[PDB]
Amino acid sequence: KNRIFVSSSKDFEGYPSKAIVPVQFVALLTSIHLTETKCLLGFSNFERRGDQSQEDQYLIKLKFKDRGSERLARITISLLCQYFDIELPDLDSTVILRDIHLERLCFSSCKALYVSKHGNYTLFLEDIKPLDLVSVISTISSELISECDLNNSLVDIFNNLIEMNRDEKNRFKFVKLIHYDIELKKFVQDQQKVL
Amino acid sequence: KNRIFVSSSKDFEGYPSKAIVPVQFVALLTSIHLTETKCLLGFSNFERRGDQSQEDQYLIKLKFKDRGSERLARITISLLCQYFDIELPDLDSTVILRDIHLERLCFSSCKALYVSKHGNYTLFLEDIKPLDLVSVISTISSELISECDLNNSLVDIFNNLIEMNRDEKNRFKFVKLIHYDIELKKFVQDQQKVL
């Protein structure tokens, strides 16, 4: 099948015009929306863009129509949030979760299908491995088209956070995370900066 | 809405013969099946019905038809399996897992819809809260139709597993549990087996 590792949503500019292409990317979950009829997840790696718009650079659709597919969407979202500790209305009373990175770091590794037609592209999720903050920290310390890309992306995003953190202009701050933590503080300082 | 707590799947016998009824139950996950067209989760509380036919008392359909819904079943299965550490085949090349309780104890609280028609009934998953073992150990220390049933239900299940473990005819043994643990040996042979 040859799934392709995508380091940057920028990658998709020079992707085919009318194609189905299996990809994989490693990013922070930043937004979730679930409405009457739509379900979105947005993710970002926060690569210095320009640095115009840094959140939700990856928009993944969970298409649904009838009531079964809607439920499955809700259950996916619910499990996803449960893993990352995100608080959610109880089924028995929409979901707007933006800027999830300001409260929680929710590293995710995602398999999606890139689908391009009529001069635009869309991303449909096929899988998602939520990644645990400690494992992500530990690690920083099969298609032929992927291999040790996990490491590099995780290293980049965290360097990108180090720049957003100390940037007076950016709302993100390490200390503002809910799970802010001795382990985190040391990681951010111990070597991350010295590197 | 009046979601109803269900302590036993036996309850569903005297349920209306043609309705949609929202229920909630607490069981161990015992099986997953994913095929080309179907996706089933089996659960059990292990009540002595009994000493004859004990796993998969509850069968929960995750219905799909198109490719989008199939993906959503896969993503759901994946996340659930990930929360409980169940190893799954990689997506890039069906799932058959039975008697999951031989290896992992995967407590779950489930919200389903009970849907009876033509003399028969089926349960459609709406939510699922995978429950952590340490927390289930800790606990054992709203609609108007749910009480404090969680605890009662967890206590019974553990009461059943204890009986299952000393049963020479039942394959279940605590020691053979992958996550066998100093804390579990205590809880098992400490009070539960003393009360």
What are the DSSP calls for A100-118, one per residue?
GGGT---EEEEEEEEEEET
Breaks (C-N over 2.5 A) in chain B follow: 93, 141
**CB < 8 Å & 24+ apart, contacts of A9-15:** A9/A57, A9/A58, A10/A47, A12/A114, A12/A121, A15/A114, A15/A116, A15/A121
Chain A positions touching B1 (Cβ under 8 A) are: 92
Q: CB distance from B136 to chain A under 8 Å?
A: no
Q: CB distance from A175 to chain B under 8 Å?
A: no
Asked if residue B50 has a cis previous peptide bond (ω within 30° of 0), the answer is yes
User: B120-130 and B58-61: which strand pairing?
Assistant: parallel
Q: Looking at the DSSP assignment, which residues form a beta bridge with residue A21?
A: A114
Q: CB distance from B76 to chain A under 8 Å?
A: yes
3-class SS at B155? helix
- Both tokens of residue A27? 């990013």
- CA distances to A69, A74, B73, B76 from B70, rounded to whole Å, are 9, 15, 5, 10
Q: Looking at the DSSP assignment, which residues form a beta bridge with residue B111?
A: B24, B127
A73/A20 Cα distance (integer angstroms): 22
Identity of the residue in B3, B63, B82 whose CB atom sits nearest the CB atom of A129: B82
> A46: distance to nearest CA of chain B, Å?
25
Q: CB distance from B144 to chain A under 8 Å?
A: no
Q: Can you give the resolution of this entry in Å? A: 2.5
B106/B29 Cα distance (integer angstroms): 5
Q: Which stretches of chain A are DSSP H helices?
A: 67-84, 133-140, 149-166, 182-187
CB within 8 Å: B75 and A3: no
B11/B119 Cα distance (integer angstroms): 15
- Write phi, then psi, for B117 (nearest 5 degrees): -165, 150
Domains of chain A, start order: 1-141 (2.40.50.800), 142-195 (1.10.10.2380)
Q: Looking at the DSSP assignment, which residues form a beta bridge with residue B44?
A: B28
B183/B137 Cα distance (integer angstroms): 9
How big, in percent rounded to 5, are the helix, strand and coil portions of chain A? 35, 25, 40
Contact between B154 and B7 under an 8 Å Cβ cutoff? The reply is no
- Both tokens of residue A183? 């382990």
